[PDB]
Design a protein around this nucleic acid. Structure first.
Ligand SMILES: [Mg+2]
Ligand SMILES: [Mg+2]
Ligand code: NA
Ligand code: NA
Ligand code: NA
Length: 326
DNA sequence: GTCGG
DNA sequence: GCTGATGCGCA
DNA sequence: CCGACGGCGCATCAGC
């Protein structure tokens, strides 16, 4: 793609700030810059040309100058060489290990996949399962496999109760040719902003997905959000499909549209849409959009009959799901 | 690290 | 047991 | 100049 070198550089810097420095705002600064540069329709010739874009300030522009002159970045070269930095970065690639826990493990001499396997007693459940499937989770899911996963989930959900609606969101709903994992929005008429008329609505779906051996492990689970692991069935004599991350989110049926906006993403898109709402005096979460009062606090939910209605409030032209990718 | 006020 | 804080995950 | 910077579910731990 057009400015891949620059955006790769900014992503790598973002990850270093998040994982090693634990400087979450620098992380967000680099992500924002990376995003805006990724959509820019020309090959960037200078750092001062980048500087024009919002979110690209002095420091990133200098770095871009150095990247375009020398084809690399010295700041980043020395981070790749730092033993403690690279190790902390690696460990964070395990699901369940964040920046804090990664720094802890490196300080105790635990720096590699082998060190982790040799020390499974030190790992909570989530981290155990993230290590187990370390390799499978690094792989992307071809859309063709997502279509098989969709068919299994919708049909098994339809068998628990025909009133559930499942919708597959994330990168899939944005039309990507492959996904990092599977994101499933769930609704049932008995769960609304007014009442939970029926208990265990998510449980029964998880349970049924376990019964037929689609869901294989659980990372975390509660009344409205399931995070775990699934796998497609394979044919006689065939190599098994990799295990895949699956997230299931139960959202009140009267708040579907805010839910599907949230869960369709992208994450950076969600951050910018929500930021823009605040400039306009609103707050958007996955349940509602509420006007911000004259003091600061949020009023009562405004009426929403569609995704578009949320865009209209904040005076943004509608973006189709496929146009909300980085 | 960036930016609006 | 509770609550509040924090880590880590999701888009 | 600076303080603001999306929003929240579940797991875990500290303090009661
Ligand atoms: Mg993701
Ligand atoms: Mg996803
Ligand atoms: Na700029
Ligand atoms: Na991680
Ligand atoms: Na996901």
């Amino acid at each position: 793609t057009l400015n891949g070198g620059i955006t790769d550089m900014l992503t790598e810097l973002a990850n270093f700030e998040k994982n090693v420095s634990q400087a979450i705002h620098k992380y967000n600064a680099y992500r924002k810059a990376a995003s805006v540069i990724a959509k820019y329709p020309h090959k960037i010739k200078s750092g001062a040309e980048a500087k024009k874009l919002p979110g690209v300030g002095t420091k990133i522009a200098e770095k871009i100058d150095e990247f375009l002159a020398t084809g690399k970045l010295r700041k980043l070269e020395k981070i790749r060489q730092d033993d403690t930095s690279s190790s902390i970065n690696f460990l964070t690639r395990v699901s369940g290990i964040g920046p804090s826990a990664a720094r802890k493990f490196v300080d105790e001499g635990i720096k590699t996949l082998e060190d982790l396997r040799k020390n499974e007693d030190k790992l909570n459940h989530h981290q155990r399962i993230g290590l187990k499937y370390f390799g499978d989770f690094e792989k992307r899911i071809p859309r063709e496999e997502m279509l098989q996963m969709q068919d299994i989930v919708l049909n098994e959900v339809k068998k628990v109760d025909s009133e559930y609606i499942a919708t597959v969101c994330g990168s899939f709903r944005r039309g990507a040719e492959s996904s990092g994992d599977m994101d499933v929005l769930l609704t049932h008429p008995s769960f609304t902003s007014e009442s939970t008329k029926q208990p265990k609505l998510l449980h029964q779906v998880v349970e049924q997905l376990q019964k037929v051996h689609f869901i294989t492990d659980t990372l975390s689970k509660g009344e409205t959000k399931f995070m775990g692991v699934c796998q497609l069935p394979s044919k006689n004599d065939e190599k098994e499909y990799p295990h895949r991350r699956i997230d299931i989110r139960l959202i009140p049926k009267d708040q579907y549209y805010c839910g599907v906006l949230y869960f369709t993403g992208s994450d950076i898109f969600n951050k910018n849409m929500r930021a823009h709402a605040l400039e306009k005096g609103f707050t958007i979460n996955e349940y509602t959009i509420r006007p911000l009062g004259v003091t600061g606090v949020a009023g009562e939910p405004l009426p929403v009959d569609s995704e578009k209605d949320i865009f209209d409030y904040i005076q943004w032209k509608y973006r189709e799901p496929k146009d909300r990718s980085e």
